[PDB]
Design an enzyme around this catalytic site. Sequence first.
Site, mmCIF file in Angstrom:
data_model
loop_
_atom_site.group_PDB
_atom_site.id
_atom_site.type_symbol
_atom_site.label_atom_id
_atom_site.label_comp_id
_atom_site.label_asym_id
_atom_site.label_seq_id
_atom_site.Cartn_x
_atom_site.Cartn_y
_atom_site.Cartn_z
ATOM 1 C CB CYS A 60 21.929 18.716 -5.588
ATOM 2 S SG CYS A 60 22.669 19.783 -4.325
ATOM 3 C CB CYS B 294 21.658 18.948 5.238
ATOM 4 S SG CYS B 294 21.524 17.424 4.287
#
Lengths: 263, 263
Positions: free
Chosen positions: B63, B202
Amino acid sequence: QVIEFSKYNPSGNMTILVHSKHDASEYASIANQLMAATHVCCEQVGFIEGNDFHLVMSGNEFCGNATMSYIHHLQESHLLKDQQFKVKVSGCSDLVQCAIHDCQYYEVQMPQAHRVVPTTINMGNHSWKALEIIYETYVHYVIPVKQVTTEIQHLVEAFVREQQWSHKYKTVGMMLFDEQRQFLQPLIYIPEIQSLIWENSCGSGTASIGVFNNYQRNDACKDFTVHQPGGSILVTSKRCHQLGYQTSIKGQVTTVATGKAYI
Amino acid sequence: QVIEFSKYNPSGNMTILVHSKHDASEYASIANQLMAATHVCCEQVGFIEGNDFHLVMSGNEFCGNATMSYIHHLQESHLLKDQQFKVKVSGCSDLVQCAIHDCQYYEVQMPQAHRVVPTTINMGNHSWKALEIIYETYVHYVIPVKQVTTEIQHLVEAFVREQQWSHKYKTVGMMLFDEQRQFLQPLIYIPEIQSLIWENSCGSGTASIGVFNNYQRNDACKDFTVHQPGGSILVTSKRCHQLGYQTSIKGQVTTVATGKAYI
Ligand SMILES: [Cl-]
Ligand SMILES: [Cl-]
Ligand SMILES: [Cl-]
Ligand SMILES: [Cl-]
Ligand SMILES: [Cl-]
Ligand SMILES: [Cl-]
Ligand SMILES: [Cs+]
Ligand SMILES: [Cs+]
Ligand SMILES: [Cs+]
Ligand SMILES: [Cs+]
Ligand SMILES: [Cs+]
Ligand SMILES: [Cs+]
Ligand SMILES: [Cs+]
Ligand SMILES: [Cs+]
Ligand SMILES: [Cs+]
Ligand SMILES: [Cs+]
Ligand SMILES: [Cs+]
Ligand SMILES: [Cs+]
Ligand SMILES: [Cs+]
Ligand SMILES: [Cs+]
């Protein structure tokens, strides 16, 4: 600014209490920052201020679920024993009757329903019997349903959005109630901002079910279980001759977090 | 169980890092409880474990936004000076290149795009040119648009829901990109759970815009601003002959809260 806070789960209606001292002039700004989805995030913020219990809501209204969170904080953190006591809460002329009961159940006196009006509401090709419950600063419609459905939920949204609401009512509640399942699907409409929210749970809505039960049966109810999406809340309600409706809600609360927030 | 945590805002994609030590066997359960809307609530949970920097994601994937939060925690809490360093992150075979830059900008090396395929996708009565960007464990489609619209958003949802996706792709990204406004509206689809989310921001999608720019212009980009709903992220990307795409993202992060969570 550092804010000392606790986050609580009273049947899924997330509440923050602020422990640190701030000027009342800042409560609005502090609460708006904390309740944001890009911050700690919650539905409601209360500030904990001999007459030692004082809870101030960021909007200065009364909140049963925030008062219930505050009672839990008093039991958990200040180790209060089971007892009956009173708290000063914003939005209330008189001190609020509270109780810590055995098994960490917390009871809160709720605002008095001034009067009720049996009515029918038309939505689509159907009419539904409803009880209009009028408070000083809001109105709830209790609408008995065979089962809650997305169709009925869409109909109820259309109904609140299409209606004109007295400016007396800061909130308009549509309380869809499955009597057999004792299940409440609460919708809260805020006329001023034209916003709707299908609440996980509704203290004030639970209180309205107690008044509905009193009207419907002429029976008091005691620890009547109101199931909701976020969990359940108990309601105790009786009409007391000329004193009118006397209603309280009782529930459990979990602390989910405590520490420092940065605004 | 008490969990020591911090909550961070990296362009609106809310991240929790856990500071307290737990068995890796519990990360899944701890993270699931913390990310719930009825708890602290977040999108992603990382566990902070001589080779001293180790971040483990609750799902064991890489991530960028959580790594960027971890870099911020290192600067803020451990007072690291501006420098280039490497971090071990779940989901990565090699240590990840990180940097603390002046003005609290944090740079994270992103997974290498293996290859690109210029394609057209049919949605409704319209076709759109798109660049399919293939990674080891996900695929992004970059779709240049004149402007993002609810109509286009509905079309994109229908498209991802109607398509069959290789089980190679843990996520399918539809990256709607307004080239003139440098504005990204990212949609993430998780095939296994058939769930869609229009992300506030994102990291991985931002990285894909850098690869798209490289393909489209044969130009490197450096500190290219990708505006998104939750804020903005910078992307630096170049194709380096046989070494292929080398892409990093850079952003700022705010700590919103630190303390103890109860699960
Ligand atoms: Cl002041
Ligand atoms: Cl009205
Ligand atoms: Cl609105
Ligand atoms: Cl274990
Ligand atoms: Cl595929
Ligand atoms: Cl689904
Ligand atoms: Cs003051
Ligand atoms: Cs909120
Ligand atoms: Cs209205
Ligand atoms: Cs009305
Ligand atoms: Cs109310
Ligand atoms: Cs009962
Ligand atoms: Cs009961
Ligand atoms: Cs272990
Ligand atoms: Cs969540
Ligand atoms: Cs699908
Ligand atoms: Cs496909
Ligand atoms: Cs990804
Ligand atoms: Cs630039
Ligand atoms: Cs720039």
